[PDB]
Every structure is written in C-alpha cells, then in structure tokens.
Write a protein that binds this ligand. Structure first.
Ligand SMILES: Nc1nc2c(ncn2[C@@H]2O[C@H](COP(=O)(O)OP(=O)(O)O)[C@@H](O)[C@H]2O)c(=O)[nH]1
Ligand SMILES: [Mg+2]
Length: 164
C-alpha cells in the first residue's frame, strides 16, 4: 500500500510539491488548504508501475485534530519545512513525533527542505537537515516546487523505499 501523507507548518510548500508532481505546474499565489484533500497518481519505477495515494493536510491549528487518523493510515509521511523559515524546521520535530506516535517504526518518513530556490534567505543548511534526518532515522531531500528541483526524485525515493 502506497499512501503518502504530507505534514508541515502552513506555507512550507506541501500543496505545491504535490501539484508539481501531479501536473508539473506551480502557482506563485498562495491557496491555503482546507481540511485534508486526496489525490492519486500512478508513477513508473523499477520496471513496474505504482499507484500512489496522496493526502494533503492543512497546517492551520484548527484542522489539527483531523490529522492523526490520516497519519495512522499512511505508509509514508512526508514532513516538509521551508529552508528559509527556522520555525518551520523546528516544528518538524512535532510532526515526526506525531508520526512515530501513530506508526512507530512501521512507516517510511521523508524529511523535506523545500524552497531551495530562495538561496539568499536560507536559514537551515543542507547539512543541518541531513544530520537531523540521520539522527531521527528518517530519509532526507531538499526541493523547490517552484523550479521543480528534485521533486520527481522525492517521489521516486519514497516509492523505491516502499517497494523495498
Ligand atoms: N519560492 C518558492 N516558493 C514556494 C515553493 N513552494 C511553495 N512556495 C510558495 O509558498 C506559498 C505556500 O505554498 P503552499 O504549497 O500553499 O504550502 P502549504 O501551506 O504547505 O500547502 C505559496 O505562495 C507557494 O507558491 C518553493 O519551492 N519556492
Ligand atoms: Mg496546502
């Protein structure tokens, strides 16, 4: 089962990463997510096809109580932060804890540093993100939904982990 849940503070880029993968497009305008939405996409990898189910969650504190149910049901948790926002990175500990609380070790977690295109506003180094992922035993990658940088690789890697 290939069910991915996207977690992270508001404005880090969860929706944009999903949209970039789904339709290979990006919108600079912000469109806050309401509740939890579901999207599906079949992708290719390792001589086969995999049906991915994506669950985009809203970071607003008022939708918080609806997330645990989705996390429990997901085989992959993509925890996203904004490389230019220190708070968003610090908050990944909250999200990862929520995931572990629901799935323990029976889950694939990918920590994502998004918005790498905003290099002149970077607050978290790539090494700091890599080390945080290593210490928490989760996977790591940096992306830019805006340019598309590493977005397909993000999904390729999580799907590969699932097939393994
Ligand atoms: N520069 C830049 N902006 C981004 C990137 N990803 C998302 N954004 C912008 O950041 C804002 C929030 O994006 P959104 O996908 O709604 O984030 P979400 O709240 O986590 O779902 C929007 O204005 C996006 O256009 C990125 O990689 N680079
Ligand atoms: Mg969103």
């Amino acid at each position: 089962k290939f069910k991915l849940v996207f977690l992270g503070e508001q404005s880090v880029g969860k929706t944009s990463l999903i949209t970039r993968f789904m339709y290979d497009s990006f919108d600079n305008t912000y469109q806050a997510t309401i509740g939890i939405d579901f999207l599906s996409k079949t992708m290719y990898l390792e001589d086969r096809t995999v049906r991915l189910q994506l669950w985009d969650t809203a970071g607003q504190e008022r939708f918080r109580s609806l997330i645990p149910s989705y996390i429990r049901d997901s085989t992959v948790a993509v925890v996203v932060y904004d490389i230019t926002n220190l708070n968003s990175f610090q908050q990944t500990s909250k999200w990862i804890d929520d995931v572990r609380t629901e799935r323990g070790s029976d889950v694939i977690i990918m920590l994502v540093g998004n918005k790498t295109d905003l290099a002149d506003k970077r607050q978290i180094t790539i090494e700091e993100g890599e080390q945080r992922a290593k210490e928490l035993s989760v996977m790591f990658i940096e992306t830019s939904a805006k340019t598309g940088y590493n977005v397909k690789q993000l999904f390729r890697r999580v799907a590969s982990a699932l097939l393994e």
